[PDB]
């Protein structure tokens, strides 16, 4: 409705003779707006701005300032937004203004998105996206504080609203264009509140815009390393198939590229990967390889991801980190547990420091009163008669067998399944 408003407001105009009249401006500012108003052209618009421009932004928040019609008010703001779309540089004349009054240009406009009408507020507040998106001097300090306040007040309360929503995110999508700003954001709580709405399951450009700005984070090591308490991944893993929105796709595709591109270490890479391979990313980015999009752009974060993750799960194949997760007892689903690639190729190392890890297993087989735990030892049990036809003989040594086949009778349905598996799999030869 952004849009449907603004040319509303331009048909909308008012005398402002009247307001020169009740004094509430300067003979100046009423003249500026005027002339403003008939220099239609883009000549006339460079003229007026480069022969008054000290009077320009003057007399917009003059104007602004002392006139209670909201009428006029959404008219400034409507013309400076079509001047910064026609060309986005108009934020010079602005920051000139401010600096030939020995001011920035923020304390003059900040204070006016305390009114009421929304429309006023959030083309101020796209205005000041604008100037700090397109200035030379950064947004900081008080007045960054307070409109991120802002922005995350207006976020907090996800439809008109919804609509005006998707200005409040543009202009943080703007803000984060700029690296320093990103840091501020990460310094401000921010993303948290945008997880906040995100799981109130906002509207389809809401969440797409959201998900830009997380791309816009990603796009740095340090917020990504510093962003990972949110645990994006499995909210946008199933976002991905509830809202199948091609941008919506695409953008959460390009947001987990970034993640695993600019993540500091090794490791970090690989916990990102971990947590999606854990939410199942790689089956949806196996059934979007299968489809077919019409830009490169999409294909290549598809093969990227996918190859990305084939790595990541031949690393957690590592049969090194087998044996450390049967050491610590993280005996949970990891996935060189189900990676029969490792077990046909290791399955002869559990035999090493004689038999220590089946020994972890069988005595886990035991001692375990964890169904995940418990049930993950049976199922590896099974896979080591499947995988080393030798080592059956091992398993009635270390009670293997008797173990799984009294917790077939388990109190709990997957240990019970996992343990009849495995003594399927035991009973198959003589």
């Known amino acids: 409705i952004i849009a449907a408003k603004a040319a ?9 003779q009247s307001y020169l009249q009740g004094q509430m401006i300067s003979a100046e500012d009423c003249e ?4 403003f108003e008939m220099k239609r052209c883009s000549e006339e618009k460079q003229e007026m701005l480069q022969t008054e421009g000290s009077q320009c932004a003057k ?4 104007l602004m300032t002392h006139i209670s019609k909201e009428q006029t008010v959404q008219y400034i703001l409507t013309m400076v937004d079509d001047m910064l779309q026609e ?3 108009r934020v010079s004349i602005f920051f000139d203004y401010a600096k030939r009054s020995k001011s920035t240009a923020w304390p003059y406009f900040l204070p006016m998105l305390n009114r009421q009408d929304p429309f006023t507020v959030h083309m101020a507040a796209r205005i000041i996206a604008k100037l ?4 030379k001097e950064l947004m900081e300090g008080s007045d960054l504080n307070y409109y991120f306040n802002w922005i995350k007040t207006q976020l907090s309360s996800q439809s008109d609203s919804s609509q005006y929503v998707q200005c409040v995110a543009g202009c943080l999508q703007l803000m984060l264009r700029v690296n320093e700003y990103r840091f501020a954001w990460v310094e401000a709580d921010g993303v948290n509140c945008i997880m906040g709405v995100l799981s109130n399951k906002c509207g389809f450009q809401l969440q797409y815009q959201m998900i830009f700005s997380i791309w816009l ?9 510093h962003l990972r308490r949110y645990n994006i991944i499995p909210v946008l893993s199933d976002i991905l198939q509830e809202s199948v929105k091609e941008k919506v796709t695409r953008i959460i595709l390009a947001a987990f590229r970034n993640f695993l591109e ?7 890479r690989q916990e990102y990967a971990l947590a999606m391979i854990q939410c199942k990313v790689l089956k949806q980015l196996e059934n979007l390889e299968q489809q077919k999009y019409d830009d490169e752009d999409i294909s290549e974060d598809i ?3 996918l190859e990305k993750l084939g790595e990541s799960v031949q690393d957690l194949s590592s049969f090194d980190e087998y044996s450390s997760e049967l050491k610590s007892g993280r005996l949970e689903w990891s996935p060189v547990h189900k990676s029969e690639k490792f077990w046909r190729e290791n399955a002869v190392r559990l035999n090493e420091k004689n038999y220590e890890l089946l020994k972890i297993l069988t005595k886990l087989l035991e001692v375990s009163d964890d169904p995940q735990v418990l049930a993950v030892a049976a199922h590896d049990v099974g896979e080591y008669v499947r995988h080393y036809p030798r080592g059956k003989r091992v398993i009635e040594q270390l009670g293997g067998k008797q173990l799984v086949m009294n917790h077939m009778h388990h109190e709990d349905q997957q240990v019970r399944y996992n343990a009849l598996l495995a003594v399927q799999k035991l009973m198959v030869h003589n």
Do not use: Y
């Open 8 to 16: 509303e407001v331009r048909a909308n105009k008012v005398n402002w």
């Open 32 to 35: 500026f707006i005027q002339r």
């Open 59 to 62: 007399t917009f928040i003059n």
């Open 87 to 89: 060309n986005h540089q």
């Open 132 to 135: 700090a998106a397109w200035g």
């Open 217 to 225: 984070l990603a796009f740095s090591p340090q917020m990504c390393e």
């Open 262 to 268: 600019k993540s500091t270490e090794r490791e970090t």
């Open 303 to 305: 093969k990227f991801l």
